[model samples]
Each structure stands twice: as C-alpha cells, then as structure tokens.
Target chain A: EMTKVTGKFDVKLTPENAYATGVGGVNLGRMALDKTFYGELEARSQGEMLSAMTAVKGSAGYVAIEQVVGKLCGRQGSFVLQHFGIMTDGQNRLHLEVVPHSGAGELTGLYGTMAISIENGQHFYEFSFCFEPA
Target chain B: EMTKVTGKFDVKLTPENAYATGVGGVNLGRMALDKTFYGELEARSQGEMLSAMTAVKGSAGYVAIEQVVGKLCGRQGSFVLQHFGIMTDNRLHLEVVPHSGAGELTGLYGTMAISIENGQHFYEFSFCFEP
Candidate 1:
C-alpha cells in the first residue's frame, strides 16, 4: 500500500562574486515522477551573476519499492530508484539509481537523506532530504 | 577551401530496444571549421535492442566553409553542433550546429520515397536527405 504527492521546488546555487571564478549557476525546475517513484525536474537556468556560456539542467525522481531496513533510520522504509537531471543543459540527465529504505525490526516511518556539494574550496551543496507526512 | 573524410562510424546506443537511438549512443565524434566550416556525420543505431521498444539516441559533427553552396562545401558553410545516433541515421546528418553549433534538431528525417500498394504493398525506402 502506498501514496504520494508531487510539487515544484526552487534551488538557489551559490556563485562566487568574482570575475576570476566566473559565477555560480542556479538550478530551477520541478518534479513529476510518481512521488512514490521519482523526485523532480526543470529546464533550469545558470541564473544570476553569470553569462550563459554553458548550461546545466535536469530532473530527479524515484520509484517506490518494497521496504527495506535502513542503517541510518532503524525503521521500515521504502526503497527507491532515483535519478537526477541533466549534467549540463546541453547534456542528458546525470542519473544514479538509488535504493533507499528504512532501518528495521520494529522501527518504521523514518526517511533517508542524500547530500550534494560544490564549493570553490569545498563541495558546493549538500542535502539531507526528508519528508513530512501527507 | 578545404576537404576531409573521417571514420565510417559505428555507434551502439544503450537501452531496451536496448534503447538510445541516433548513434546507438556512441558519441563517435566530429570535426569542422574551414577545412573550412563543417558537413556530414553518421546515422546511429539501437544496438542492444534489449526490448523491441520505441527508443531514442543522437550523433555529433561539424562542417567546412565558403561552400554553403555545396553546403558545408569548401567555402563558407560553417559553425554549429551535434546529433546523436538514431538521429544521425536519419534525414540529415544527425549532428548539426550553425548558430550555437549544437545538435538541437529533432523528429527526425529520412526522405523515403515510400509507395503504398493496394494489396501486399511495396513500401521500399530510398532517397538521400539534406540539411
């Protein structure tokens, strides 16, 4: 038994305020995958403080699968096949199939997280994604 | 004025149908500008044919210039970009780009002089395409 909802999101990527480092790109878009199956999407722009020299865009989603025991959550979580958007706008999506589930043996309802990073000296971004009950 | 001819192109796209059409997913690669400008590329494939399904793919290439008359002809036909495998195997050379010089055209090509017969029908395919 499963249920899911879909919505749009706003991602503001950080860009350096220097001419030497060019600019940081911004990704904008939405998701339409079966919330139970996928994540999000967008045409995306390399927004603000930057020229469109290159483009990076894409969408992310998942497919809900049988639950599995997650090491982090210690609960019963659903496994998913996840994919991300295009690597560069001109390119296709950068995809990595991920199966995320819950911890186990009585623990349930806990969700997992995925982190993304990219910075001048450090990875820019990291996401510890979670969900609120619907 | 310039001239060139590269490899015979063998692209093997990915997926069910095994998927990925145009160039069978093989980037193959291309060249352009004078030799002047660019012209020509290949028609890709759906190699894996994993699941006899509706799949998609693309290819890439460039042209020589001054020959916009010959079209990428040796004179002034220059600038642009790519096209994947299946697309490469279609109407025009899949890979293209005169402006930003990228592979952006879609749906398709292939100018088949198809003829529908009343009975069993003889719909053989032929006819070279253009950009």
Candidate 2:
C-alpha cells in the first residue's frame, strides 16, 4: 500500500544555451532548476533540464533529473528525481519518479512517484510513496 | 578498445501534441520514435522525442532517449541511449551518449557520436563494457 503526500513547490528555471551544431537546424535547449517544497513534506531540489524543437506546433519532449534532500513525513534522507515530460500545444503529460535504489540514510528503500501542477501561477506537488521497513 | 559501426537506420516518428518553447512563437512538440539499426551491431530502439523552434530558419533543438536491446556483435544485453542534437540552417550535430547498462550490458561505459552520410544515419560506439 502507498500513502499520498501533498504540498506546494516553488520552482525557478533559468534558460541556458545548449551545445548546438549541425544541419536541419536542430538542437537541444538546456535549463537549470531550483525548487523548494512546503507542506506535509519538506524538500529541496536542484537539477538540470533539456528540451528540443520540432516542426509541428506545440509538440516537444523534455527530460530532467534532480537531487532531492529533505524530510518526508518526518523521515530524513535524500534521493534522486527523474523527470520525463511531453508537451503539445500547451497541455502537458509528465512522469516524475525516484531513481531506483537512490534512497539514503533514513530514506533507504524509499520509493515513490511525483506529479506537478500549476494553478493561477502557483506550483504544486503531489507525491505518493512507500518505504520498506527494516 | 573501440569499434566503428556504420549502417542505416529506418526511423519512424509519431506526432503528439501542447508545444511551448518560451520563444516568441509558441512551439513545444512531442513525438514517439521507433528505430532499427543494421550493421556491425544489429539492434532496435524505442523512445520519446522533444523539439522546439528558434527565431532563425533551420534552427531548433531536440533531445531523446532510446532503450536499445539486441546483439552487439554476438553479445546480448540492453542499455540506454541518449540523443542530443541541434540544427542550425542546413547544418546538424548529434551526440549519442550511453546512459546506463543493464543485464549482460551492465557496467557499460562509453561515448558515442552520430552522423549522416549518403543520406543515411551512421553511429560510432566507443566503450569499455562487457555484456
């Protein structure tokens, strides 16, 4: 069984230039991310993101990974976050997860999934997780 | 030791839609990619792709990750392949990096570069991994 944790996240993304070269005028864009979480669980994340350009309107994919350190319902530890997102025309479908065996300290054996949402300019996070008790 | 493998890849791309690039023109796109390789090493790959448009023509960026599984010169296993490519006005550059190894391909480590010649896609894989 799994438990649900909800909270608000503050994220800041800085656009960075990607290593661009070659024909067909294609390349990947890069960005730096910094975020903080508040609510049932508190955490902080730092990561990098990459995106691409497409001929079709509103269709692109991006992947990201972050290092998260903080407390989950009073459990202290850290883990890695991986992001897989797809966008088309202004809508988004995303998948965020904890990297396999990334948990540390009290976070050992911690596993979970995360979702991001924005409402009226505010960012939110919904996390579902479970831990293997020793 | 590293080996050079050159061949052709048949690529199939599918469109998915919500494209936003933070550029003047709204363009953020998504797609699914299915590719097959025939050469020194035969393998098939599947993954997702993302791209955006810049102000200049022949200018855009794209990134993708594919899970390639099959026989790499008689060895069997799987690994993750990353594509980081850019296009700028009739020019293109692509980098293929081996992400993580799995199964027999575990402990694989290396860097790869991709190119096109004779209107065909070719790959150069250099690694120190045992599968």
Candidate 3:
C-alpha cells in the first residue's frame, strides 16, 4: 500500500562543512501501497547579523527506488532544485559549472544504511555513504 | 587531466513541485583529481512570505559522490539541515520524528546525476536515471 505523507525537514551542516544531519516532522496519510513516493518544496531563511551564502533558497524534489533493488533492502535516488543563496562569509569564494562537474570526495566507505518512519507527527533518518574526495 | 570551473544557475520550480531547476556559482581549485567532491552551506530567504508560524530558520549541506560507483561517473550522497518555515496562510501543521524518517521516493529513476564546474563561477546539470 502507498503511504501519503505531509511534513517538513530541518537540515544542517557540520563544523568543518563535511557532513550533515536532518530532522523532520511528518504526518502520514492512508495511501496503502507497501512503498511510496514523495517530493518536497521548501523555503528557507538566513538568520544572524551576517548570513551564509545559499543558492538553494528553495527546493522541490521527488525520490523513488525499488525496495527490492539487489537484495531486498530497497535502493533510492532523488532529484532536487536549490534556487538561491547568499554568502555567509564575504570572502567565501565559489565556482559554477554544467558539464562534468560532480564526481566523488575523500570518504572511503563503500556502503551504508538508512532508516525511515513517518507516523504521529514525527520523522528521522541517518545516512552513511562513505566517500573519497576525487 | 584537471580542469577548473565556475558559473551561476537560476533555479525554477515545476508545477507539481516534484523537480527543481538550479543555477549555481562555482570556482574549482587546483586540487587536481580525476574526480572531485563538493558541498554547500546555504540559508534561504523565503520571499513569498504571506503568514507566520515558521519554527526553523535556514539550512546547510554537503555532497560527495564517487565518480566510480559500480562502474564510473560518480555515486553521490548528501546530508542537510533546514531550519525554518512560513505557513503562507495557516492550516499547515507537521509532526516531528526521530527514528526512521527517510528511505526513498517515487521518481521511477534510480540515480541522481550531478555536475560541477568552477572556471566561470556558474553551473548547470541534467539528471536522468534507471530502475
């Protein structure tokens, strides 16, 4: 059965700016399907006297994968659009590109696991995708 | 075997709000690797504000994908923290959870394709996937 959901997520970055943590608030509806699909559109705000540069002022995305990809644990993929940003540090520099722009980093663990539970107005998740900076 | 990049992207929203358009600004350094990783810390300013009652403030995140996942190209993943919201009108309530909250959504596509460049400080990418 497909489960319909409505909620919000709070995403944050780490000190060294390497990893992150996300906290979410959700309310699931009765859709009835074993697996479900979801996409979110969120608006953000910059706090403090000076703020960080963010190009992704807002995002809209949807995710879907087989709960039976290779074995049976489920595999997933998502697409998001981040629309705006302001530099938290004036000296912070950046570059943008279109072609072969993304590859990998220095986190070297090949795998990880994630969890999901949406009920009674609560949501949380943990991701562990180790990588090596390319 | 190393090229820098930079550019800006203008992001727009799709009707159902499923997919998004992003224009980015970037500048690559001399790290010099066949593959590279990226991360961005951003805060959003919700301009279309109409109401109040937003509990959070902003968000931040980073991404690092292996350009050689099973074959090559780049397998990536990211983490984020978003803190804030505006009700637009009210009647928008949510529940917060801390156990299992994420798994996957339905796009039929299995992978997320991303790109980066830093010479001009502007960037764009087209994503496609398979089940």
Candidate 4:
C-alpha cells in the first residue's frame, strides 16, 4: 500500500558552471537547488540540475537529483529523488521517482513517486510512497 | 511530416571523475561519450553522462547530453540530444528529449530507439524537421 502526503516547499535555484559547456550554439547549464518543505513532510533538500537550451524558443530539457532528509508521516530518515523534464514549444513533461536502495535510516527500502505543482507562484508537492517489508 | 532514418553508431565511453561523488554508499559516476554515426547520417558527437548505481543489483539511472555535428539526410548542421535512462532489475527505459535542435537542425523533433545485438550497437531515428 502507498501513503500520500502533501506539502509546500520553498526552492532556490542558483546557476553553476560545472560539467556542461555550450556546443554548436546549444547552451548547457547547471544549477544548484535548495529547498525547504512544510506540512506533513518537514524536510530540507539539496540537489543539482543539468539543463539545455536549443536555438528554438520554448524548447529545453533538464535532469536532476536531490536528497531529502527529515520526517515523513512521523518516520525519520532520508531518500533520493531523480528528475527528468522536457519543454517542447512551451509544453512541459516532468517525471520524478525515488531511486531504489537510496534510502537510509527509517527510510530504507523506500519506493515512491513525487509530483510538483505551482499555484500563484507558490510550489507544492504530492508524494506517494511505500516501504518494502523486510 | 516525419522522416525515418536507420543507421549504426560506434560509441566509446570513458570514465571521468568530475561532479557527483559517492553518497551513503551509492556510487555516482561521470563519463564522456564519443560517437560516430553512419548510414543516412554521417556525424560525430561528444557528450557527458552522469550515472548512479544503487545497492540494488541491476538498478541504475543515467542522464546525458550530446551535440551531434554533421549532415543528416544531406542537411548540414548541428543539434543536441538529451538522454534519460533507467534500469530496474535489468529492465531499461531510455528517453530522448525533444525540441533540442539547433543550427540547421533547428526545429528538429523526434526519437531515436537504440538496440544492441551481439555487442554491436544500432539506432533507428524517426524525426521531423520543421525549421
């Protein structure tokens, strides 16, 4: 069975020049993410994102990984989330999932998916998760 | 309208230790990719990949971005391909990000499916050029 939780998060993305460089007019970028979660999940996360911009407007792609640590549903531990996103002609598709075996402490064996939405410029997350029986 | 192209690509992956260090026993690795395309598209590309290996066997994920510079279907230019791959218990899902075209390859939208047989790599690309 899966448990669902909802929370609001504040995020800051800072541009960083790291592994990627521009090539043939394509701009590759890197960013650092700092986030704080509230509500059912009180946690803080840090992550890195890689992005690319093409010559055409509204077309781009990004991939990211983040580690969230804190308490969820009163259980304390940490886990990792992997993200893949694409923007085509202003349309967007994003996927976020928990990395297998990336949990520690009480979060060990955690498996789940996460969705992020923005309303009125505020960010929110819906996380559906379950822990494997030992 | 979309055009289909089939070809074979030779790829070489070299490990690089930049960014993404080990975290909590999970090993994060970075690699450089060099590829040469043949048949219908003659090109060369350079890219970087980030990969993670968890404690679970056969479960891993990787993301990569490469710039292909060459002639495709006789059209000359360059573009980028973004890759997102996941392997869970040896089942794999790989995606090629769209709207990553640039230069003469601008407005390019498509997907490339890859297969490996007998240690040889092959690619079948379906694309639409709308520039």
Candidate 5:
C-alpha cells in the first residue's frame, strides 16, 4: 500500500567548484543542497548536486543525492533521495526517487518517489511512498 | 540514421573529500574521473563524482558529470554526459542525463551501455544527430 504526503520545503543551494572547469564554454558546477521540510513530513536534508550547462541556450543537466532525516508520519528515521534533471530549450524533466534500502530506524524498507514544484516562490513536495512489512 | 560505436574505455578514479562526511554513519565521498575512449570514438574525458553509501549493505548512490572532447565519427567537438546511479542490494540503475550536448555536437543525442567482462571494461554507444 502507498501513502501520500504533502508539505512545503525551504531550500538553499550554494555553489562550489568541481574537479574540472569544463571545455569550450561548457559550464560545469557543483552545489551544496540544504533543505527543511514541514507539514506531514518534518525533516532537514543535506546533499550535493553536479550540473553542466552547454553553450546552447536553455540546455543543461544535473544530478543530485540528498539525505533526509527526522519524522515521517510520526515515525523517526532517515532515507536518501536521488535526483536527475534536464532542461532543453527551457523545457524541464526531473526525476526524484528514494534510494532503495537506504532507510534506517523506523523507515527501513522505505520506497518512494517525490514531486516538487514552486509557485509564487514557495516550494512544495508531494511524496508517494510505501514501506515493506517487517 | 543512428550510428553505433563499440569500444573499450580505460578509467581512473582518484578519491577526494566531499563537503560533508555525512551524518549517522552515512558515508559521503567525492572522486575525480579520467577516461580515454578507444575505437569508433576516440576521446578523453574528465569529471567528478559524488557518492553516498548508507549503513545498509549494498545500498548506495552516485552522481557525476564528464566532459568528453575529441573525434566522434570523425567529427571534432566536445560534449557533456551526466550520470545518476543507484545500487540497492547490488541491483543498479544508471542513467545518462539528457540534452547535455554542446559545441560541434549540437543536436547530438545518444545512450551508452557499459559492461565489464574478465576485468575488461567495454562500452557500446548508439547515437543520432539532428541538425
């Protein structure tokens, strides 16, 4: 069975340097991710993201991994989330999912996907998840 | 028409320190990757990777971005490939980020599959160009 949760999240992305600066005008960047989630899930996360921007306008790709810890549905634990995002000519495609078997404490056996959106500068998340029976 | 390129790639991974060591026994790591491609596509690549290893055995995730430069089907240019990989109990999911082509490789798109047999690393890349 799956459970759905909705919440608002605050995020901060700070730029860092990657190993290589890239070639021929391609911009390679790294960033640190910090986030706090409220509502049905209350948690804080830390992570890193790697990104590449081509010379062509509005074309880029990024990948990230984040670890979130705190309370979910009154259960205390932690899990990891992985992200892959792409933009082509301003069109976006993003995938965010829970890393299997990466849960601990009360969240062991957790599996899920998360959708994020921003409206009026406020970030929101809709999470759909299920946990295997003990 | 799509062209298929098959070859061997030699890669070297050198470890670095990430911004954080992680919390609660989760291991966070950073590494630099250097690779040379041989065969239908001859090139060199440089990139970095970030990874997380959970306390749970066989569970991990990684992200990377590599810039490849040289000759592809005799076309000279450079492009970027972004990678997202996860390993859950040794089952893996690896994806190449899309729409990351650049330079003389504009409109270039493709997928790459990698395998290791007897300690030899091999890659098969299928690509198409749309101008």
Candidate 6:
C-alpha cells in the first residue's frame, strides 16, 4: 500500500563553480545541498547539482541527485532523490522524486514522489511513497 | 504521450547575415530570432535563422537551430530546438531538436512544437526526464 508524509525541511545550498557557455547566452555552474528532513521521515541528505543560467530576466534551471540516510516512519535505511528545478520570469518550478530501485537497507523496493513548497519564508515537503516491508 | 503550452511571444529581427542565396530574385535573409514564451513552458529562445521566400506568392519557409533555456511545467532544464517552419496551408511548425537536453536538462528528452491560432501564439511539448 502507498503512504503519505507531510512535513517541513531546511535546506542549505552553496554555489560551487560557474563558467560562461554562450549557448543561449547562459552560464553553467555546480552547487551543493545539505538538508534535514523532519516529521514522518527523519533523515539527513547531501547532494550535488548542476545548473545553467541565462543573463536575461529571471531564467535558470538545475538538476541534482541526493542521498538520504536515516529512518522513515520506523524503518531504517537510505534512498536517493532526483531533482529538477527551473526559475523563469522569477517563477520557480521544481520536481523531486525518489529514484527507482535506489533504496537500500530497510528502504529497498521503495517508490515515492516529493513536492516542495515555500510559504512565509519556510520550506515544506509532501512525500508519498510505497514499499514492501522486509 | 504529449502535452501543450500556450503563451504569447514577440520576435525581433537582427540585421546581420552569414550568407544569402536567392532563387529567381527571392530574398533569403539571415536574421537572429529573439523570442520570449509564456504559459506552461515559460521560456526565451535565441537563434540565428534563415528566411527563404518561396515562389508561391503567399508561402514562406524558415530553418534554424535555437536554444531554449527556461521552465516547463514546473520543471527546470534547457534544450535546443531545430526549427522547420513552412506555410503550405498557411500553417506554422516549430519544435525542439531530438535528444538535445543538456546541463540541468541532461537526460531530458522530448519533442516540443510551436504554433499560431487566430494571431495568437502557443506551444506543445512532449518530454521525459528522470523519474
């Protein structure tokens, strides 16, 4: 059966390196992420991301892969998260999901999707997942 | 499996040319296309395109390779669009090139096409990236 978890998380992003790649007049760069997830899923995550930014009015996009090591509900294990985000015209759009077949330890066979929202200067997440208990 | 993105756009022409070849005095001009898009795939595209005039009084054609760096349906990535525009039924066709997603758009693949209706511009995009 599928399950859902809603909670808030804090993320720290550090810009790494960047260079100008004149395609569409954009710059390419890399970044790092550290996160602490709370509520139903208590875990800590670390990740690396690649980005492209255009010099024109609010346009940028990034892709990342993250690993979460800790516990979900009562099960202890680890999983991977894939992220895709874009900022256009000052509007932000993001996609974060658990990678298929990437769960380990007690998290094997896990499948999930995550949605992120920022409200009142705080970031929150809603994760829905399914897995077979080992 | 496909999706659509509707929006407004403005195209500006630049006064630079690489080369021009005309058939029976039909002018072929090289121009830079600077366009901004909205709706589901809010983006801006830049490219060097060629406008070729056909013998048909009202028919025209265009070919170009452009880069689209922006957001699509809340996802972020950038890809190249290999455009082929024609007007046989007085119609327009624009789309992204195949397997051209790069950067944050790596592993992103799909077909994105553009159109016009009643003097309004729109786009249709079909793609897959990650899980």
Best by lDDT: 5
Tens digit of per-residue lDDT, candidate 1, span B47-113: 1111111112332221111111112212221122222211222322222211221123211122111
In model 6, what are the clashing residue pairs, if there are any?
A: none
What's the distance in Å from true for residue A118, model 5?
Answer: 0.9
Q: What is the TM-score of chain B alone in each candidate?
A: 0.20, 0.79, 0.18, 0.87, 0.87, 0.77
CA displacement after TM-score superposition, residue A61 of candidate 6 (Å): 1.4
**Model 3 Cα shift for residue A9 (angstroms):** 14
Ranking by TM-score: 5, 4, 2, 6, 1, 3
**How much lDDT does each candidate structure score?**
0.22, 0.62, 0.20, 0.76, 0.81, 0.62
Q: What's the C-alpha lDDT at position A102 in model 6? A: 54
Of candidates 3 and 2, the better by lDDT: 2
TM-score of each: 0.21, 0.52, 0.17, 0.85, 0.93, 0.50
- B21: Cα error in model 3, Å: 31
Question: What lDDT score is found at residue A30 in candidate 1?
Answer: 17
lDDT tens readout by residue for model 1, A1-134: 22222323334434322111111222111112121212331112121111112222331111111121122222233222222222232443322222222212222222333334434543222223354252
Model 5 TM: 0.93
Q: For model 5 chain B, where is the 10-residue window of minimal lDDT?
A: B90-99
Model 5: runs farther than 4 Å from truth?
B23-25, B90-99
Which 10 successive residues of model 6 chain A have the least lDDT summed?
A: A17-26
Q: Model 6, A78-126: lDDT tens per residue?
A: 7766665666676757666665555667777677889888899988889
Q: lDDT winner between 1 and 3, please give it.
A: 1
Worst 10 residues of 4 chain A by lDDT: A16-25
lDDT of 6 by residue, B10-116 (tens): 56668543232332223444566687878777777776554545343554545454567788777677776544444532433343433345555654555566567
**What CAPRI class is candidate 1?**
incorrect
Q: Which structure is stronger by lDDT: 1 or 4? A: 4
Candidate with the greatest DockQ versus the true structure: 5
lDDT of 2: 0.62
RMSD after CA superposition, every candidate: 16.6, 16.1, 22.2, 2.8, 1.9, 18.6
Docking class of 5: medium
lDDT of 2 at A30: 63
Q: Interface root mean square deviation of every model, in Å?
A: 17.0, 16.1, 19.0, 2.6, 2.0, 19.9
